[PDB]
Structures are given as structure tokens and as C-alpha cells.
Write a protein that binds this ligand. Sequence first.
Ligand code: HEM
Length: 153
Amino acid sequence: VLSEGEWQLVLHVWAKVEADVAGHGQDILIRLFKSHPETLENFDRFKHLKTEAEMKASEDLKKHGVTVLTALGAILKKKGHHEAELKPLAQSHATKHKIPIKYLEFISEAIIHVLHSRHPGDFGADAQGAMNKALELFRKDIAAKYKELGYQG
Ligand code: HEM
């Protein structure tokens, strides 16, 4: 369970993301795909993309990054009270998309990497620790829902 102070560190960097969620989403999805190419294969929608340049030029990838980060932001703004937001997400990701917890760990790493690069002013060590805790909580709760839904993750 995060403290209020930790949540405030999370939300203060998220405020920066929200200056340009689209650009942040591009960087995060591209970092995920570059660092863990098997994750790209998981997206039938995107797996044709061959290069970072093609990724950057895809309007469709940009749209999806906005969707992803806005969903995550809505979860983070609940400060742990995210049951309602996690239900549909866990169901789609367990049963339609089939995303293992290890891949949610990979996107978490990509989020931390991009925030660390873009936001040294709001992403020092304590802030990164807080974000890690928030993403750990998200993954813990999603993995519990995966169980309940019949997916090992
Ligand atoms: C922070 C973690 C993530 C969030 C918040 C998130 C959010 C979303 C949202 C909101 C959608 C659209 C609605 C839905 O289907 O549920 C979606 C779709 C999808 N997600 Fe995620 N996602 C996350 C991580 C991942 C990861 C790590 C992968 C794969 C490695 C993945 C694969 C997919 C796929 C395949 C779709 C469908 C894309 C399409 O064909 O339109 N997601 N995600």
C-alpha cells in the first residue's frame, strides 16, 4: 500500500506526461518493442512494423499509446482504489490478448525508462521508487484478477 506522499510523486510526474501523452506513448511502446521484441509479436495490429522509424511514423501506434497511457493514468489517479478500472483491463488482457505478467513487467520497465530519460526534474530516485511501487501494485492486482479469470499469466 502506497503512502499519500508516494502517490503525489506518481501524480507529479504523470502531470508532465500529460503535457503530451501521445509523444510519451510513442516512446514507451517503442522502448518496449525494442527492448523485448517478442512483445511486438503479440500485437497482430503492429507486428508488421520493422523499424523504429516505421513505429514513429505510425499514426495508429500513436493512437494506441494514447489509449494505453490514458487508461494507466486513470488507474494511477485512483491511488489504489482501481477495482473498477482493472476488471475490464484484466479480462481483455487475460482472455483476448493473452498478455503474461512478464510482459506487464516489461512495459513497466519501459515506462520507468522513458520517465527517467524525459523527466529528471520529477523522476529522481524517490519518485522512481514511488512509480515502481505503483506499477508493482497494478501488476499484483492484475495478476490476482488473472487468477480469478482462469489465466495463469
Ligand atoms: C500498463 C499496461 C497496459 C495498459 C494500461 C494497457 C491498456 C490497453 C487498453 C486500454 C487497450 C484497449 C482496450 C482493451 O482491449 O482492453 C489495450 C489493448 C491491447 N493491449 Fe494493452 N495495455 C497494457 C499492456 C499491454 C502489454 C504489455 C501488451 C503486449 C505485450 C498489451 C497488448 C494489447 C493488445 C494486443 C491489445 C489490442 C490491440 C489491438 O489489436 O487493437 N497490452 N491495452
